[PDB]
Amino acid sequence: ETPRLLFVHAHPDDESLSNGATIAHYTSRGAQVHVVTCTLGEEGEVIGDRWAQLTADHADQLGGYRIGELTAALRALGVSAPIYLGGAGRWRDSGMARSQRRFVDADPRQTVGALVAIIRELRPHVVVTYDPNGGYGHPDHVHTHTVTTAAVAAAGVHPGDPWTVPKFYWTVLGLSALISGARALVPDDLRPEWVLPRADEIAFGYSDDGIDAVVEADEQARAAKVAALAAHATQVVVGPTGRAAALSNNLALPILADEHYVLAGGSAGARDERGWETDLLAGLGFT
Ligand SMILES: [Zn+2]
């Protein structure tokens, strides 16, 4: 069949920050790729003045605005539309700017059930989400991991026909890639106010030995990631060469074409000399 991949993320922007080049790699090769976003990003902050009054401290309309940002970003990556877990607006994120519908406080029967329904409908060959620490500990990222882990297990056996996801991966930050990438930046790649952080300010990184797979995307796919990040204008600032970006904290990272993964469930396919698979579909018999 045509391969089917599912990426499950907490907020609008995370899909591009983490998996933009992988998503673009697979959609350009004709795979069916879907992104599930668990919240609208209602509690986000905004870069710049134009949309400053949309945040939760003023009009509290930022999540609605971010639907268009996500849609634009997904389109840049070859994905036709967003999917919000439980429907757009079901569960609210926990951000910087009281709620009776916060995703972290949600009834697990409802969040796991929603995701299980998605997995059983789509029948993905691959599911991707955060590691157990959510990347850098954001409560919504940790909860997405919890919900997704539970959904993958339960989707095998809720209504519908059981589907055992062939390969379940965690998206992680590759330390050696980030270091190499950062070393390759030049001052032209950064805005004056940016600083290159040490890895521990932005993520719980992984050594080469703790990584199972890499998707080493081409320049077309990296450019699609750059465009996707640009679409999230309230959240990300892309640098002048499209080689680095920063969030509102001014901590700049390289926009790399290589994305790394830990195989959490399933059997690996053929690994390269680093001991890494080079295709999330490895071993599944796709030509
Ligand atoms: Zn996030």
UniProtKB/Swiss-Prot annotation:
PANTHER family: 1D-MYO-INOSITOL 2-ACETAMIDO-2-DEOXY-ALPHA-D-GLUCOPYRANOSIDE DEACETYLASE (PTHR12993:SF26), N-ACETYLGLUCOSAMINYL-PHOSPHATIDYLINOSITOL DE-N-ACETYLASE-RELATED (PTHR12993). Gene3D superfamilies: LmbE-like. Binds 1 zinc ion per subunit. NCBIfam families: mycothiol_MshB. GO terms for biological process: mycothiol biosynthetic process. Its EC number is 3.5.1.103. Keywords: Hydrolase, Metal-binding, Zinc. Catalyzes the deacetylation of 1D-myo-inositol 2-acetamido-2-deoxy-alpha-D-glucopyranoside (GlcNAc-Ins) in the mycothiol (MSH) biosynthesis pathway. Shows some amidase activity toward S-conjugates of mycothiol. Homodimer. Pfam families: PIG-L (PF02585). It comes from Mycobacterium tuberculosis (strain CDC 1551 / Oshkosh). Its cofactor is Zn(2+). Belongs to the MshB deacetylase family. The gene is mshB. This is 1D-myo-inositol 2-acetamido-2-deoxy-alpha-D-glucopyranoside deacetylase. InterPro entries: GlcNAc_PI_deacetylase-related (IPR003737), LmbE-like_dom_sf (IPR024078), Mycothiol_biosynthesis_MshB (IPR017810). GO terms for molecular function: N-acetylglucosaminylinositol deacetylase activity; zinc ion binding. It catalyses: 1D-myo-inositol 2-acetamido-2-deoxy-alpha-D-glucopyranoside + H2O = 1D-myo-inositol 2-amino-2-deoxy-alpha-D-glucopyranoside + acetate. Zn(2+) binds at H11, D14, H141.
